[PDB]
From a paper:
Here, we investigate the molecular origins of the nearly billionfold rate enhancement achieved by directed evolution of the computationally designed Kemp eliminase [name] (7). The Kemp elimination is a well-studied model for proton transfer from carbon that has served as a benchmark for de novo design. Although the first-generation [name] design is significantly more efficient than an “off-the-shelf” catalyst like bovine serum albumin, its specific activity was further increased 200-fold over 17 rounds of mutagenesis and screening. All [name] variants have an inactive conformational sub-state, rooted in the original protein scaffold, which was gradually supplanted with a catalytically competent sub-state as evolution progressed.
However, ensemble refinement of crystal structures for all the variants in complex with the TSA points to progressive increase of the active configuration as the key contributor to the catalytic enhancement. Increased ordering of the Met172 and Met237 side chains, which interact with one face of the TSA and likely stabilize the charge delocalized transition state through London dispersion forces, illustrates this trend. Although relatively flexible in [name], Met172 becomes better ordered in [name].7 due to shortening of residue 84 through the M84C mutation, which enabled a stabilizing interaction between the terminal methyl group of Met172 and the π-face of Trp87. The resulting conformation helps to position the catalytic base (Asp127), which samples many unreactive conformations in [name], in a single orientation with the geometry required for proton abstraction. In principle, Lys50 in [name] could act as an effective oxyanion stabilizer and constrain the ligand in a reactive pose, but its side chain points away and forms a hydrogen bond with Gln90 instead.
Author numbering: 4 to 275, 279 to 303
Write the structure that this text describes.
């Protein structure tokens, strides 16, 4: 059975998966994605290192491949990460001038979003902008542009493609008692009150064993920021316990603004702790069956 079809029948938009050309050309990834997932996200092909490895010299081959594959197979598409401190070319981090970096960041956002205009359901505009204590991570963007880099990124993205849902995403938003979760909520509330177009908070849900339970409280907390949408993304779970996976699914089911869930790959050997839903033989694991059973009605 298809977790995407079943979650849609529960009123959600999609059950998605991260992938890219190297997965879709090998093994059973394409067949599993065709059958079981309604949205694809690029594991790497839309990050800054892949798409703009030297300034103004864009490489769209991998991103084009994924977008084309998705359209041919009837899948929704997400993109990202537009602004991130990891996988960032040295030519970017070497910039110390505010105007220069602002213009570079805007051009990077606008170029990618314009190329795929109208084809992308949601973009991860800014990723991993928070320290664990809830302060803002001191990246080149923060240090050179200042705190306005987040407003600027979102305003630029909205102008480039107003069809897309614009997300901020972060990890360790899995417990309501951890400072980072309330901190991003507070800053997103404030940004939106200032007119910044943040449509979504995406929770990069990389769990250890037993951490699914806390998501039942953390995801409603994220939704209290008042964004149009929240989502689970890059989901994986060390040990792949059905209990942890079912808890995350139920958290999304319980939150009206949660639009869907994306799992961080297909088969365990291709994971970034056997933490995915398909084994090395590309067979569904107990956690996959448990999600199916939970979503059936
Ligand atoms: O939901 N995802 O797994 C996922 C993977 C790669 C991404 N890049 N930007 N957003 C992403 C989400």
């Amino acid at each position: 059975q298809s977790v995407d079809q079943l979650i849609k029948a529960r009123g959600k938009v999609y059950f998605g998966v991260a992938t890219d050309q190297n997965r879709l050309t090998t093994g059973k990834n394409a067949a599993i994605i065709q059958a079981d997932f309604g949205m694809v996200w690029p594991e790497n092909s839309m990050k800054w290192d892949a798409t703009e490895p030297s300034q103004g010299n864009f490489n769209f081959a991998g991103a084009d491949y994924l977008v084309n594959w998705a359209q041919q197979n009837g899948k929704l598409i997400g993109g990202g990460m537009l602004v991130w401190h990891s996988q960032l070319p040295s030519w970017v981090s070497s910039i110390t001038d505010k105007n220069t970096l602002t213009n570079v960041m805007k051009n990077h956002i606008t170029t990618l979003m314009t190329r795929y205009k109208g084809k992308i359901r949601a973009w991860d505009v800014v990723g991993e902008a928070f320290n664990e204590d809830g302060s803002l991570r001191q990246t080149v963007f923060l240090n050179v542009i200042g705190e306005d880099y987040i407003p600027i990124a979102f305003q630029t993205a909205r102008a480039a493609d107003p069809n897309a849902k614009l997300y901020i995403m972060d990890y360790n938003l899995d417990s309501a008692s951890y400072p980072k979760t309330q901190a991003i909520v507070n800053r997103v509330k404030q940004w939106r009150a200032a007119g910044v177009p943040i449509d979504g908070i995406g929770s990069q849900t990389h769990l250890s064993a037993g951490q699914g339970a806390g998501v039942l409280q953390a995801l409603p907390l994220l939704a209290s920021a008042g964004t149009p949408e929240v989502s689970i993304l890059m989901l994986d779970v060390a040990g792949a316990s059905p209990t942890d996976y079912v808890n995350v699914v139920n958290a999304c089911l319980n939150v009206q603004s949660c639009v869907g869930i994306t799992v961080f790959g297909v088969a365990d050997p291709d994971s970034w702790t056997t933490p995915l839903l398909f084994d090395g033989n590309f067979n569904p694991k107990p956690a996959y069956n448990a999600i199916v059973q939970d979503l059936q009605q």
